[PDB]
Ligand binder design. Structure first.
Ligand code: ATP
Ligand code: ADP
Ligand code: MG
Ligand code: ZN
Lengths: 286, 54, 252, 199, 287, 191, 50, 76, 70, 54
């Protein structure tokens, strides 16, 4: 019953660290570590974490090794330095996940009952794509379909702390993106707010034409999850929109009509005071 | 478990340091209080004894 | 179990402590002017969900030690001088250790038990529910066991004032103790108040009287206006008890 | 490992204070001897059911945690009145007043010695005995010998010592003399020259 | 030997360990060890910083059993990468940044055991608005007090990177220790993704301001510039028609010029021209 | 003073739920672990012994550690109820020998086969040619039931250390009240 | 605006009432909450300031 | 015998001590060779704290043993 | 940069702070204020604070560190 | 030269103290202006002849 997780801006920096702590000699091209958290009531929080030596062979894709003794000491070391933080799960990077992630999860559920994984992106960082989290659930599948795992998605957000947010602003120092914007940042928030829109909409038809052909089998779960999108968008016809839209559009044109009136008197007064001061310095210089 | 006041700051429950012995320390006696750990370093006698020879 | 006691102390060890303060007024939607018990005055805010409408100008809150913003509000101090005036057992009696007084017992049970149980009999008749009564007479016939009887039956809240631990060396302490007493009694609505020996702070208010007795007169004038004054005393009834009902104030 | 971590983080320098009230929604308001008020969600080592308003607990200077309690403090005048451990005295030292001696042995020691001697009959022992008559005969000296043999934590009380200069001192002093008498269960109370405050 | 061109290279995830461990114990002076690498004589980097458990009070801080440190560094060799330590840190929450009594004693122990061992001071309760007062200091020997102390000007960039304030030069500067310059090792795939996750949005641009309080907010903006226009009518025209001094008390301590009356107009446009155009897209986009 | 990483590999398959011996096969294989962990202790205290299963999953119960008290707590209560899976058991043991804290120890893997193996001859020779290219010596000890002179195990011992290798002895115990006397004659010293 | 902001990030200054003091670049300043202090003069001011 | 005091700073200090010596002698030798007082030195042998009240033969310290030098960590 | 300085002055004042009293004014952009904890101070003021509001001993705001008339 | 070294050996913001009593062992008890009494040491260039209680 996880609503959402809160990833502090510290742990992903430790992943980017440990993505570079192995890349000098390692060709593993995935980083698997241990996620520590603070399960408060219903929302999940992640403050600190660490990593663990893990490898995986591409042949037979079922062989793995976790270091339990390093997990027992270092989590026990963190408990002594901070008896607030505890285990909440694990994490791995790489978009394409290997299939030992059920085998890793079902082992370390002996540590955490509500075990959770967090997928981050180190290289796919160009578009708007945050970190990703799933959940460990065990059902059959749907009704009469064969049994499997089916990691369900839990939505994720990012939240800092008081020093963890003020220390960020001192680091950037390049554009800094001020609060409430002066008509230039706000339009770009609608520009790149829409650049991610059709990128989702191109992605829907790409999976749809993949399954309209029939290569991969269908999932009925996504069908009605897509079907309530199209028969719940509004249709603007008469007396519910076209009356009520002008009632707030002809409302907001009255107050910008003051901006036409007031700002014209502002620059006119600055014109008068300069044309007085110009001709009076001119007539008295000679 | 010595209860000691400053009468300007507070009352403190402190201990003697490991330089003196818990033999001379009685009730109503000045001590040498550490500035940070507040420990009794050296006990002070209340200006003994210019009232016997006279 | 010994491990569970250890881990509770580990969670207890990571604690800060909070600055007790009182809200003076509200400046804006997020600016509150508070003040500590001796420290300066601050301009702080609330956390996330504190229901700022409950922040009345004169409540008591608990500030953060470092952020200094409001963590949790508190009802009221209860000034431990009167803490002992509530926590005591009367006699575990049940009107069976008393006799030969049933004409006066029931008449006292009439004036007290009805407003704290049965207000419908007082709405049907155009009368205000009454205030407290008085016990006077020679020493020996009840006067303490009778209040001990009624504080065993339906003890919602109870205060027993000795009327002789209420003054001291300090000249403005006496009337301050009475005001903070009734506010505890007012807040815990269905309370009953007992005061033995009204003769100790009674007296007729007379002329020039060697200022040690002037304080008792100023103490009594505070007791007058708190009983029947500007504040509508509701759900609070007062059993007064004396031994010589001759030298009391006619205004009392 | 946990008890070792409690021990090292337990510093010895404390700060005495006073509990004002105790709430549950466990929580206690603490006023220190620095004239400062503090509030904590969790008390700490001691229990919420063992405290009372008016205790001199040991509080941390920085985290403000109730570490130890052990108050046992009173007024200097009340502690001056605790007079015990006298040389003994026999009842045969008083001659001629032996009936009043037997009326004391039939008054005080058997409520103390044999409580089950009364609880089967259903009666309740009294608790007030007066010595009166000519001065200098048997008033203080009889109860001196009764406290000498039957040790029951003697506590004298003088008459004019209750009369202080300032207003509202004897009501403090008498009531503090009996809060000490209530906490010491085998203790007794002896009041002398009661006519000096007896109007 | 000693230069005046040293720059410590702290990482971004180093400094986030510094403020979080410093804000964790505020009234008890947290205390940890700083791990990095000496790449040459006079540039030192530090990327990952661990912490140590403490048992100290609000003015001094002690340590714990030293079987924790060597067991920690042994386990950090097999996981990630190994290093040797380059210094230490603490938190001075009350005052600013200067090295106390036992702070110089532990500095003498580390520069003799290890090589040079830069110490770092952090005020956790000062880094509040937008700025941090973190600084690093470094002990100088007392024997070379008749010649230069941080001598031998190689460059000229050592003057505008640090200007010691009056509260700093009274304790140890410059007769006891000296200060050292700090830059930030910022790179890619760490810094860009730091802002690709914090100050981002998807639907924030195409979302209405929920007119229950939008046009309600514009009531209390028109009425206050109404009063400023009441104030503006008399003010300028009376000042110009009585005395043409272009000066006093309407110059020295005033606030009602033509700077105050258009910024309320400036807020009222940006809050509404965006809000007008945000309700224009969904008429086309959403059928 | 030999520096190696001895990796013991017990079997908790379902076929261990019987006694062909007068004692329990689980008690027989448990005491087999006791006499080899005490063997590697007295020879050099600078080694490490770690247990690993292979039945239905190769769950790392204890990490390869120089302590023995963690192993002795976990040698008991193993609950053998799984199906034997041997082809992944070598690759997970070699993956455990790569994740070590020191790369100066030698490599020795002992395994306990208490159930018949049903594997392709290609799958054993690919693992055998892998360990030749990795220079890894694996000992194979048979428990309980055993087909005498198997094709798969004998060709795996041959293709392990061919052309004057180490001498990884194939222990063939007969059924009966014989204890690990066949396991302490040659393999406790001449492995 | 940067000039007003740079001097803003600076601690406050005390006040001390001085009626008379001594010479030799040391003056006698008595603060209000505490007692007197023998302090040093600045180089931007003179000494004849009694 | 010769010992290898493996410090935590990547520097191995070789000492010439005897098996019948104690810890205070090693601390004095380290102080004479460098300049660290004995009260600010914590010798660790295989994760075990060494006490000044015992000798080197009590902790099974033979020739060529790996030690760990930890200094007194305290700030203010 | 000018929009930076507007936001900097904006968030210099929205913080928890102490309350002192205005005592006196030296000249333009400098005053003498004393807090409620005794210990009369000497700080500088801002230009946003209107100078025609500070005749009496009025209630003012002060920073905890810079201690200025915020 | 020697006069300038000792005039700069002490701190510059010198605080006005108050003597209470004198012990002839290179230290004494003093009193601050707030009445806090500090068991401090006394130097040797202090010209120990005019030192009076008060
Ligand atoms: N009317 C009564 N009925 C039954 N018992 C009584 C009555 N009056 C007194 N008692 C007995 O007296 C004891 C209580 O004393 P009581 O409260 O009457 O003293 P008091 O009248 O309050 O004295 P004072 O008036 O001097 O305060 C009880 O033990 C009770 O048994
Ligand atoms: N019957 C008696 N036997 C022994 N001593 C007596 C007797 N009567 C009086 N005294 C002496 O007289 C003294 C006064 O008695 P005390 O108890 O003080 O009476 P009061 O308290 O009324 O003065 C006692 O100290 C006691 O020694
Ligand atoms: Mg009575
Ligand atoms: Zn420090």
């Amino acid at each position: 019953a996880v609503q959402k997780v809160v990833v502090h801006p510290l742990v992903l920096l430790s992943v980017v660290d440990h993505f570079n702590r192995i890349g000098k000699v390692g060709n593993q091209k995935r980083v698997v570590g241990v996620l520590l958290g603070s399960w408060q009531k219903k929302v999940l929080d992640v403050s600190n974490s660490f990593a663990v030596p893990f490898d995986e062979d591409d042949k037979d894709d079922s062989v793995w090794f976790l270091d339990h003794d390093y997990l027992e000491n270092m989590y026990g070391m963190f408990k002594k330095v901070n008896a607030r933080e505890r285990i909440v799960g694990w994490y791995h990077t790489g978009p394409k996940l290997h299939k030992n992630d059920i085998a890793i999860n079902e082992l370390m559920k002996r540590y955490c009952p509500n075990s959770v994984l967090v997928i981050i992106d180190v290289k796919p960082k160009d578009l708007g794509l945050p970190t990703e989290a799933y959940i460990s659930v065990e059902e059959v599948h749907d009704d009469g379909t064969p049994t499997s795992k089916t990691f369900e998605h839990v939505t994720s957000e990012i939240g800092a702390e008081e020093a963890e947010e003020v220390g960020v602003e001192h680091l950037l120092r390049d554009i800094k993106d001020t609060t409430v914007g002066t008509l230039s940042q706000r339009i770009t928030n609608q520009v790149h707010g829409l650049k991610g829109l059709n990128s989702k909409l191109l992605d829907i038809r790409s999976y749809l034409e993949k399954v309209a052909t029939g290569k991969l089998p269908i999932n009925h779960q996504i069908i009605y999850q897509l079907q309530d999108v199209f028969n719940l968008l509004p249709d603007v016809s008469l007396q519910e929109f076209v009356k009520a839209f002008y009632l707030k559009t002809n409302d907001q044109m009255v107050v910008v009509y003051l901006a036409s009136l007031i700002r014209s008197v502002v620059a006119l007064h600055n014109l008068i005071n300069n044309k007085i001061a110009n001709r009076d310095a001119e007539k008295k210089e000679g | 478990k010595y209860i000691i006041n400053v009468k300007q700051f507070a009352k403190f429950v402190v201990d003697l340091s490991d330089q003196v012995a818990p033999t001379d320390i009685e009730e109503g006696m000045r001590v040498g209080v550490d500035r940070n750990k507040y420990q009794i370093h050296i006990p002070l006698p209340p200006k003994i004894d210019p009232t016997v020879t006279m | 179990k010994q491990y569970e006691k250890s881990e509770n102390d580990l969670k207890a060890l990571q604690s800060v402590g909070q600055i007790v303060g009182e809200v003076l007024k509200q400046l804006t939607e997020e600016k509150f002017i508070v003040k500590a018990t001796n420290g300066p005055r601050y301009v702080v805010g609330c956390r996330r969900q504190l229901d700022k409408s409950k922040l009345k100008p004169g409540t008591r809150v608990a500030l953060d030690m470092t952020t200094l913003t409001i963590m949790r509000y508190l009802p009221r101090e209860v000034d431990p001088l009167v803490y002992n005036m509530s926590h005591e057992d009367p006699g575990n009696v049940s009107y069976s250790e008393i006799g030969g007084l049933s004409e006066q017992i029931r008449e006292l049970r009439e004036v007290i038990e009805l407003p704290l149980t049965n207000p419908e009999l007082f709405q049907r008749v155009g009368i205000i529910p009454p205030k407290g009564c008085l016990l006077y007479g020679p020493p020996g016939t009840g006067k303490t066991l009778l209040a001990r009887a009624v504080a065993s039956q339906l003890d919602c809240n109870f205060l027993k004032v000795v009327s002789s631990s209420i003054v001291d060396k300090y000249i403005g302490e006496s009337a301050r103790l009475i005001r903070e007493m009734f506010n505890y009694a007012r807040d815990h609505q269905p309370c009953i108040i007992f005061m033995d020996e009204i003769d100790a702070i009674g007296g007729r208010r007379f002329s020039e009287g060697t200022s040690a007795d002037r304080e008792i007169q100023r103490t009594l004038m505070e007791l007058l206006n708190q009983m029947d004054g500007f504040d509508t005393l509701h759900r609070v009834k007062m059993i007064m008890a004396t031994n010589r009902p001759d030298t009391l104030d006619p205004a009392l | 490992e946990n008890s070792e971590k409690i021990k090292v983080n337990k510093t010895l320098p404390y700060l005495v204070s006073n509990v004002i009230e105790l709430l549950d929604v466990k929580c206690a308001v603490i006023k220190t001897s620095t004239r400062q008020t503090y509030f904590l969600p969790v008390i700490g080592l001691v229990d919420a059911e063992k405290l009372k308003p008016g205790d001199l607990v040991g509080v941390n200077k920085d985290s403000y945690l109730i570490l130890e309690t052990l108050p046992t403090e009173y007024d200097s005048r009340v502690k001056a009145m605790e007079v015990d451990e006298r040389p003994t005295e026999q009842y045969s030292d008083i001659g001629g007043l032996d009936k009043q001696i037997q009326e004391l042995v039939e008054a005080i020691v058997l409520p103390m010695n044999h409580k089950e001697k009364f609880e089967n009959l259903g009666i309740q022992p009294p608790k007030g005995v007066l010595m009166y008559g000519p001065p200098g005969t048997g008033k203080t000296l009889l109860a001196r010998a009764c406290a000498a043999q039957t040790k029951a934590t003697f506590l004298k009380l003088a008459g004019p010592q209750l009369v202080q200069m300032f207003i509202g001192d004897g009501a403090k002093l008498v009531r503090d003399a009996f809060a000490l008498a209530k906490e010491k269960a085998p203790s007794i109370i002896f009041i002398d020259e009661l006519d000096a405050i007896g109007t | 030997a000693v230069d005046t061109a040293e720059q410590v290279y702290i990482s971004s995830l180093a400094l986030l360990k510094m403020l979080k461990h410093g804000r964790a114990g505020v009234p008890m002076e947290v205390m940890g060890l700083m791990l990095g690498e000496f790449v040459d004589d006079y540039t030192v980097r530090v990327i990952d910083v661990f912490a140590m458990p403490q048992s100290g009070t609000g003015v001094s801080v002690e340590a714990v059993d030293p079987v924790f440190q060597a067991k920690m560094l042994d386990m950090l060799k097999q996981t990630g990468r190994p290093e040797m330590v380059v210094g230490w840190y603490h938190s001075h929450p009350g005052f600013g940044c200067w090295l106390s009594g036992v702070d110089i004693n532990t500095q003498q122990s580390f520069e003799a055991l290890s090589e040079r061992a830069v110490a770092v001071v952090v005020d956790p309760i000062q880094s509040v608005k937008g700025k941090v007062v973190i600084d690093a200091f470094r002990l100088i020997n007392a024997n070379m007090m008749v010649l230069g102390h941080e001598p031998r000007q190689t460059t000229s960039n050592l003057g505008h990177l640090n200007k010691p304030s009056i509260q700093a030069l009274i304790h140890g500067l410059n007769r006891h220790y000296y200060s050292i310059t700090i830059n930030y090792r910022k790179n890619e795939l760490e810094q860009k993704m730091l802002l690709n996750l914090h100050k981002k949005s998807w639907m924030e641009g195409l979302t209405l301001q929920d007119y229950s309080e939008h046009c309600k907010h514009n009531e209390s903006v028109v009425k206050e510039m109404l009063e400023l226009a009441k104030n503006y009518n008399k003010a300028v025209e009376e000042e110009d028609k009585m005395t043409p001094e272009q000066l006093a008390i309407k110059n020295v301590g005033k606030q009602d010029p033509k700077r105050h009356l258009e910024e309320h107009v400036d807020v009222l446009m940006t809050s509404n021209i965006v809000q007008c155009l945000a309700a224009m897209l969904d008429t086309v986009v959403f059928k | 003073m030999v520096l190696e990483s001895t990796m013991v590999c017990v079997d908790n398959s379902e076929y261990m739920r019987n006694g062909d011996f007068l004692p329990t096969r689980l008690q027989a294989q448990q005491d087999a672990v006791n006499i080899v962990c005490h063997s590697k202790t007295r020879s050099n205290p600078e080694n490490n012994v770690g247990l690993i299963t292979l039945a239905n999953d190769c769950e790392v119960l204890t990490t390869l550690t120089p302590d023995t008290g963690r192993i002795l707590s976990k040698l008991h209560t193993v609950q053998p109820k799984g199906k034997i899976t041997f082809c992944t058991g070598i690759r997970v043991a070699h993956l455990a020998l790569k994740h070590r804290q020191g790369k100066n120890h030698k490599m020795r893997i002992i395994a306990f086969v208490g159930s018949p193996v049903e594997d392709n001859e290609k799958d054993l020779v690919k693992l055998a040619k892998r360990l030749k290219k990795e220079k890894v010596n694996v000992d194979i000890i048979n428990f309980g039931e055993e087909e005498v002179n198997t094709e798969k195990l004998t060709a795996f011992v041959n293709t392990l250390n061919g052309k004057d290798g180490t001498g990884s002895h194939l222990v063939t115990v007969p059924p009966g009240p014989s204890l690990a006397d066949a396991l302490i004659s040659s393999p406790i010293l001449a492995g | 605006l940067r000039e007003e902001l740079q001097l803003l990030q600076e601690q406050g200054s005390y006040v001390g009432e001085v009626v008379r003091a001594m010479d030799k670049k040391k003056v006698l300043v008595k603060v209000h909450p505490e007692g007197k202090f023998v302090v040093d003069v600045d180089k931007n001011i003179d000494i004849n300031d009694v | 015998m010769q010992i290898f005091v493996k410090t935590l700073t990547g520097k191995t200090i070789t000492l010439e001590v005897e098996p019948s010596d104690t810890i205070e002698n090693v601390k004095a030798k380290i102080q004479d060779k460098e300049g660290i007082p004995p009260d600010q030195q914590r010798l660790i042998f295989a994760g075990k704290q060494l006490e000044d009240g015992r000798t080197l033969s009590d902790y099974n310290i033979q020739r060529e043993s790996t030690l760990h030098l930890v200094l007194r960590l305290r700030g203010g | 940069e000018f929009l930076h300085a507007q936001e900097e002055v904006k968030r210099i004042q929205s913080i928890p702070l102490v309350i002192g009293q205005f005592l006196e004014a030296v000249d333009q952009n400098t005053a003498i204020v004393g807090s409620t904890t005794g210990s009369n101070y000497y700080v500088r003021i801002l230009s946003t604070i209107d100078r025609e509001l500070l005749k009496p001993n009025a209630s003012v705001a002060l920073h905890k560190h810079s201690n200025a008339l915020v | 030269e020697e006069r300038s070294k000792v005039d700069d050996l002490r701190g510059t913001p010198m605080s006005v103290g108050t003597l209470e009593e004198i012990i002839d062992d290179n230290h004494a008890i003093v009193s601050t202006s707030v009445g806090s009494e500090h068991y401090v040491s006394i130097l040797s260039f202090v010209d120990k002849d005019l030192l009076e209680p008060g």
